[PDB]
Design a protein around this ligand. Sequence first.
Ligand code: HEC
Ligand code: HEC
Ligand SMILES: [Zn+2]
Ligand SMILES: [Zn+2]
Ligand SMILES: [Zn+2]
Ligand SMILES: [Zn+2]
Ligand SMILES: [Zn+2]
Lengths: 106, 106
Amino acid sequence: ADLEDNMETLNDNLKVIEKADNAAQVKDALTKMRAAALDAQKATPPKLEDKSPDSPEMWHFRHGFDILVGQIDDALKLANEGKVKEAQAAAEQLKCTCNHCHQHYR
Amino acid sequence: ADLEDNMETLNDNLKVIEKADNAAQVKDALTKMRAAALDAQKATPPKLEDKSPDSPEMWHFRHGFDILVGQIDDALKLANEGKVKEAQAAAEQLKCTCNHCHQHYR
Ligand code: HEC
Ligand code: HEC
Ligand SMILES: [Zn+2]
Ligand SMILES: [Zn+2]
Ligand SMILES: [Zn+2]
Ligand SMILES: [Zn+2]
Ligand SMILES: [Zn+2]
């Protein structure tokens, strides 16, 4: 998928987790976010004029998705343990990772 | 100063900005945060076993303070224009930069 679709998948599923009632719903939404993050990691930020994969800022862009995936995996661990409220709180702590990349590259 | 003192300078002055009443108080607190950020940038995160300055994660650590300084400068621009509420809102958007580095390195 393109960057807009992957970002709206992250966006929508973050809200699904917030309103979820059980661990299966949380787990399903996190699993979809993980895939969207790894897909988005293959893209480049539009406003970044230098798109070189070896450039420090493209390293930083891809690295940000590795951090997000790691936090998604932390939340999935809690969901798989049945800890729904804890997993929802872990998903809330994703937001600063989203907002940080956005402020930096948009 | 050491890392703890610089971090508590960032912490305390973020609160000063929140409770400030005029542009001079906001400007003064942001100016002190800027200095603390550049000082902290010379340190290393304790839990990072590899302290090599050329290593990707030390590059990332120093880069995070460049981003924070840039956001501080954005807030200072607003404070210097007399835009107190706007500068306070810009300072609130620093928090995700703080929380992001913390989750990544602590
Ligand atoms: C964390 C869970 C999130 C969430 C919920 C979103 N993102 Fe991102 N994002 C990145 C870039 C470069 C853009 C700009 C895309 C463009 O200009 O075409 C975006 C954009 C968004 C949007 C806006 C979509 C729109 O309608 O314009 C939304 C809703 C969104 N994102 C959600 C880059 C990144 C990251 C790089 C490391 C990371 C991490 C995130 N975004 C994280 C998230
Ligand atoms: C943004 C404005 C902030 C604010 C308010 C704080 N930080 Fe940081 N911070 C970083 C590291 C590696 C540590 C660990 C230090 C250690 O283990 O000795 C910290 C710690 C803190 C604290 C806790 C102090 C304590 O009593 O233990 C506080 C209150 C704090 N910080 C405030 C690293 C970074 C960054 C690196 C790029 C950035 C940016 C920030 N911190 C940003 C902020
Ligand atoms: Zn959209
Ligand atoms: Zn960067
Ligand atoms: Zn980063
Ligand atoms: Zn302290
Ligand atoms: Zn890193």
